[PDB]
Design a protein around this nucleic acid. Structure first.
Lengths: 144, 129, 150
RNA sequence: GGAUAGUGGCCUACCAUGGUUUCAACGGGUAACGGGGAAUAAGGGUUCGAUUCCGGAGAGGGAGCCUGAGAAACGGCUACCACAUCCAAGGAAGGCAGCAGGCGCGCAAAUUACCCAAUCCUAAUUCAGGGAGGUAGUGACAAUAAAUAACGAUACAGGGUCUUGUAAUUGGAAUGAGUACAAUGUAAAUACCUUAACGAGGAACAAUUGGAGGGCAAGUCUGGUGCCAGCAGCCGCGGUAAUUCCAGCUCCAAUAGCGUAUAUUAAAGUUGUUGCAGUUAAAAAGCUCGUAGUUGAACUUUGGGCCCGGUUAACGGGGCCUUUCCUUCUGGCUAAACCAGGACUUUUACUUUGAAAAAAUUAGAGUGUUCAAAGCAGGCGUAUUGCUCGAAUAUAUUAGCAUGGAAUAAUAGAAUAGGACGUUUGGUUCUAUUUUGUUGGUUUCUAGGACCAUCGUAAUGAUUAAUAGGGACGGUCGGGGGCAUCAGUAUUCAAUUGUCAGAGGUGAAAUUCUUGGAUUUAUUGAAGACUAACUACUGCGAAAGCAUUUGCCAAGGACGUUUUCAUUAAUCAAGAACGAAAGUUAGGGGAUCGAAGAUGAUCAGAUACCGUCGUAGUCUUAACCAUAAACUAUGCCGACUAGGGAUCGGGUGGUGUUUUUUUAAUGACCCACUCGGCACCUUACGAGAAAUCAAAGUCUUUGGGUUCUGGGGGGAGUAUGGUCGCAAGGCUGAAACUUAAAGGAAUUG
RNA sequence: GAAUUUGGACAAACUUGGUCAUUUAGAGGAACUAAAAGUAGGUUUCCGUAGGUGAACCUGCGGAAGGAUCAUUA
């Protein structure tokens, strides 16, 4: 029984059934349609670079708040505008407008880790130097 | 329709043992069914069976003596290359010291240890333990 | 079960466990043979010959008494019809239900039953022309089948 | 025929009309050079392979060509295209996907260094050349080995006279990170190995990277900061969607490494062949027929005896006999029959063994690279003219070749004998390796074939009739279908008649009909629809569905059968038949009910959102449409597994009951049995998340055959394409994006 | 034996016409969002289809329970 063919010469039906079924997945469907190249915010890559268009102030709540807001950045290759997540307070004043930041993912395969809806990227480098080391007064930002 | 008589025989024997009967009647009969029962009888898993003979196909009455865990058929009958035989054991026997898989080789129907001892192999037929 | 129905009946005849010439018969072996060819020359099918022989003359079945079946007896003496018996009766039934369907157009039940009968005819005709009894094509058609049955 | 180095539609003339494909041809995509291989390791798989080895192709894009054995060559030429260089403005020259190096592109990648010393290649050739190649520079791609400390003495805490730790207590030893004579190394140097001299007392020569609610190891720490119509009153306490707001102390893990991002793999049985699921959680086509595909009952030499002989009485080997080695031919024993010998599947599938299968990589044997990753080295001596081991082995799962087997699954053979076998006789048709001197032709003999006829020789040739299937027949059975016919009240309308003031409608009114008599009563007539009660945990049909009488027409299941044929079967993309209600195009007829529409009153409450009139429709004919909670929310075929009582159809039996008017057929009933149905009750041998299930059982101990469908929730049955339909619409049918849940089943507040 | 020339095959490329496909301007509109802050009642739940309504919703025909069986006799 079991609903599938079982004859010794019945391999072609199994193969074409598996092809169609594998097409009904999500990983295989995005891998063999090349979705990461046409419609992805990146070019199917890990990091990216882009100039900071503007800084948008999405706070936690009404005035008694925790400051977790970041910038809207347009890319270099796609030209597409996304929003990032700068790390903790004291790092926000480093990133200015038109600041050539290098960006990475956030850690959930295209989904928002954390309780901030609508951000999938975080700033890794600002002005092409660093962000973690520049915050820890270990280096200084080069001018332009 | 009746695709495999060996499946019917083995399912009947398994159901009879799990219910707890003493003897079971199997219809139809075959050379493959007779040889399977002869191997199971040689290794002590069943008791004594008789071939009732009408003209058409025959019937078999098998008298069980317990000590039968599970017997089963493998449809389709895959070609088992000799280096693969223990692989089949490693799929469908509970342990390594007891349990048998039955190969239809060109030297007849025989258990897998005799197949390894005779350096012969063939198609798969079923298993018993 | 059935082939074109949901039924699951098992009513049939049961050949006994004796292939040897019942003792109370003790009449002949050839006399029934020219009696069979006389019955066939009268114009009956082998099944009707068999039922008349077991109803009237005590022949249990013609295979055990003579050693040959009835259709081989008729084929040996050149009484065999050009098409076999069951296909002939299926074509006859299809012709009759087709005439009924012609006279009553809105009988959709007869349409379905005719489709079933014709599919049965096609399966049987494919078997007969496969085993090389019928001519190699034989081309079953709606019209000429009427001219085939009479 | 031409052309080619050569075959070939490679080209040309002539003639045919073929060739491929549902076993997916042809077309479209590829973020596609192919392979040896790489990661992942229970197995099977999944994912990558531009890249060091092999083969292909290109030198900015096309095309053409000389030289030459070899090029459609670009560190060769010619023309066009796109770029672009130089200047005296006439003209000339160009091709880094060779090595360095630059711009651009980017998340992403090094020196315009030295040399032929090694490996090999080229040349007239030991000698010349080689950005091939090697050496060094940059280099945390990856991989190997392991520095940042070790031992005492004193005082305490201990276990307690021998053992641990603590200390702004103390003693000297050891050594390389480095600096560097020298020598080695090297084409020359750098570096490594060796080494005279210098080089350790903590802010030395100082180790980092993440984290401490759970997952997941380690805080019942400290302080400060921003908010309070909470207490107190200027000290403060407590609360703070302060998603902790931040620092310090302490602790955990790994360590010269650690973290993050994207992709991929394992855990995942979220691809399921092994190995998923489909009653209710995603998911069984509305139903049936049916082509390809997949799958398909049993049966034909088994058994016995004989020896010999391999391994530690058991396992496994081969030959003889038992009606039993059949087959294509030479050399000998002989009187068609033996031996020595050349070999054979009607066709396969399958399986064992073998050959031929690049190296590197993988598994793996040997060997102290000081160990190890590596490498194929090395080992031993009178170390004075020496000796010698090795560089194994395995894997390669398809295809092709050779070979032993004959279980399993297929194919064919004698049915109109046109079948086999021969020292059975005749005729035809052909051939000669020869002898008559060699040869051409003529004839006979001889020998070998093939063909047409007659004698025989023989156990002369046909497997069961599957609790598979179709067919025939007998008696039934059914609210199964079509046409025609018959009937029953009821509803509405009309005629006649009786009598008077209201009748309908609502929770309450109003519209409506009414002294030309409303509603009600009586008699009669007409039209269309529908078939109550009987009507059931009953029947029929593939489902949708089917309920008055009678007749005709064809069909159907089950039972009975010592009838017939002998596999004709199960399931099923393509294709097709039917398909509730609603709906569409014309004709008919219109009694009820009634979308739309029209009017009445809208009274807090409609809990009691209505009333009356009424179009399409409801009925039917001829065409369309193909959808339903089309539900048993359970595909179809087969096998087995548990008790009981009803009930429908058929059959068997009863010196059983009843009505015959004589107890003969037959009917109704009762008891027992059987086959095929619709169902019901209890239980768990079992199953399940549970509700529950005799199937939803026979399943981690997972395989009887087959078809369809599903892969977290939305976007979405939406967009686009095609196709069917007059239309309504149907069938097929995404993605971007968004989210950590949506959901199923019971018990409890 | 050069310049030059006739015919042919190999053919780069240019002008026009059609066709395929990618990207970017362009009125209009409908969707979604945070928008801290705008304008008491009916209650069976659905399915197919037809008509009507800002608005779920209502009505007509057919279907399903994914809706809670008491008493009596046999």
């Amino acid at each position: 029984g079991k609903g599938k063919p079982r004859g010794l010469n019945s391999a072609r039906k199994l193969r074409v059934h598996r092809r169609n079924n594998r097409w009904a997945e999500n990983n295989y469907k995005k891998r063999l349609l090349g979705t990461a190249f046409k419609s992805s915010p990146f070019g199917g890559s890990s990091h990216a670079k882009g100039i900071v268009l503007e800084k948008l102030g999405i706070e936690s709540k009404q005035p008694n708040s925790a400051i977790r807001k970041c910038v809207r950045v347009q890319l270099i290759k796609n030209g597409k505008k996304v929003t990032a997540f700068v790390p903790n307070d004291g790092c926000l004043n480093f990133v200015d407008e038109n600041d050539e930041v290098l960006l990475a993912g956030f850690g959930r395969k295209g989904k928002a880790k954390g309780d901030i809806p609508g951000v999938r990227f975080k700033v890794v480098k600002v002005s092409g130097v660093s962000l973690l080391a520049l915050w820890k007064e270990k280096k200084e930002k080069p001018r332009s | 329709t009746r695709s495999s008589v060996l499946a019917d025989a083995l399912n009947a024997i398994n159901n009879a043992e799990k219910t707890g009967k003493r003897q079971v009647l199997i219809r139809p009969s075959s050379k493959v069914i007779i040889k399977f029962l002869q191997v199971m009888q040689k290794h002590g898993y069943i008791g004594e069976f008789e071939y009732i003979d009408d003209h058409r196909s025959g019937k078999i009455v098998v008298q069980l003596n317990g000590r039968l865990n599970k017997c089963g058929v493998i449809s389709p009958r895959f070609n088992v290359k000799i280096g693969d035989i223990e692989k089949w054991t490693a799929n469908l026997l509970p342990a390594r010291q007891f349990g048998y898989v039955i190969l239809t080789t060109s030297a007849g129907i025989m258990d897998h240890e005799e197949a390894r001892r005779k350096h012969v192999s063939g198609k798969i037929l079923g298993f018993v333990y | 079960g059935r082939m074109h129905s949901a039924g699951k009946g098992i009513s049939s005849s049961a050949i006994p466990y004796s292939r040897n010439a019942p003792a109370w018969f003790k009449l002949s072996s050839e006399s029934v043979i020219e009696q069979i060819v006389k019955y066939a020359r009268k114009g009956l099918t082998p099944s009707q010959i068999g039922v008349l022989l077991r109803d009237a003359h005590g022949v249990t079945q013609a295979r055990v008494i003579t050693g040959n079946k009835i259709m081989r007896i008729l084929k040996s003496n050149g009484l065999a019809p050009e098409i076999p018996e069951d296909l002939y009766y299926l074509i006859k039934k299809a012709v009759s239900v087709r005439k009924h369907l012609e006279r009553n157009r809105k009988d959709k039940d007869a349409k379905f039953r005719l489709i079933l009968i014709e599919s049965r005819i096609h399966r049987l005709a494919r078997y007969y022309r496969t085993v090389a009894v019928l001519p190699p094509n034989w081309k079953y058609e709606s019209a000429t089948a009427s001219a085939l049955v009479n």
